[PDB]
């Protein structure tokens, strides 16, 4: 479920927010994405890449 | 004579500010300092 204020649990990553279709060009060997404050901001769905 | 000197002086202020880039540093640094300090605060979230 996307574009809704939800709780997500991605492989033990717990957090709260909206999930959105990205334009991030992840190279395939990468999984996660951190910010300046080291908060997760971009994540790869483990079922659909 | 005084009118001509005044007008020439005003024009020299105009192009002197327009040519020199480093005039307004007394303002700019203030913003920079606050910006720098605030930026430091954000990266204090990343230390354990
Ligand atoms: C019915 C279903 O959800 N099948 C999924 C498939 O779509 C996905 O590609 C795979 C990931 O390895 O896991 C399984």
């Amino acid at each position: 479920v996307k574009n809704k204020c939800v709780n997500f649990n991605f492989n033990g990553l717990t957090g709260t927010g909206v999930l959105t279709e990205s334009n991030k060009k992840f190279l395939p060997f990468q999984q996660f994405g951190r910010d300046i404050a080291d908060t997760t901001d971009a994540v790869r769905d483990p079922q659909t890449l | 004579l005084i009118a001509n000197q005044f007008n020439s002086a005003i024009g020299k202020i105009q192009d002197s500010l327009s040519s020199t880039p480093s005039a307004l540093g007394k303002l700019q640094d203030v913003v920079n300092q606050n910006a720098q300090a605030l930026n430091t605060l954000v990266k204090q979230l990343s230390s354990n």
Side-chain angles (χ1 to χ4, degrees), chain B residues 1-33:
Chain B
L1 193 66
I2 295 173
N4 295 1
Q5 292 188 61
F6 188 85
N7 297 338
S8 297
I10 288 283
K12 286 191 288 295
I13 300 299
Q14 196 185 278
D15 62 2
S16 172
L17 268 294
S18 80
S19 306
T20 302
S22 64
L24 288 94
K26 265 206 180 184
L27 298 180
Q28 186 77 58
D29 302 336
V30 170
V31 173
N32 276 359
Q33 268 178 21

Side-chain angles (χ1 to χ4, degrees), chain A residues 46-49:
Chain A
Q47 283 178 359
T48 177
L49 297 180

Side-chain angles (χ1 to χ4, degrees), chain A residues 35-39, chain B residues 39 42-43 45-46:
Chain A
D35 199 317
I36 306 164
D38 291 331
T39 61
Chain B
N39 208 44
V42 181
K43 49 169 46 59
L45 280 168
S46 300

Side-chain angles (χ1 to χ4, degrees), chain A residues 25-43:
Chain A
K25 292 101 166 183
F26 263 50
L27 278 78
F29 43 87
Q30 290 145 355
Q31 294 295 109
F32 292 117
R34 303 169 77 92
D35 199 317
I36 306 164
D38 291 331
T39 61
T40 312
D41 77 311
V43 69

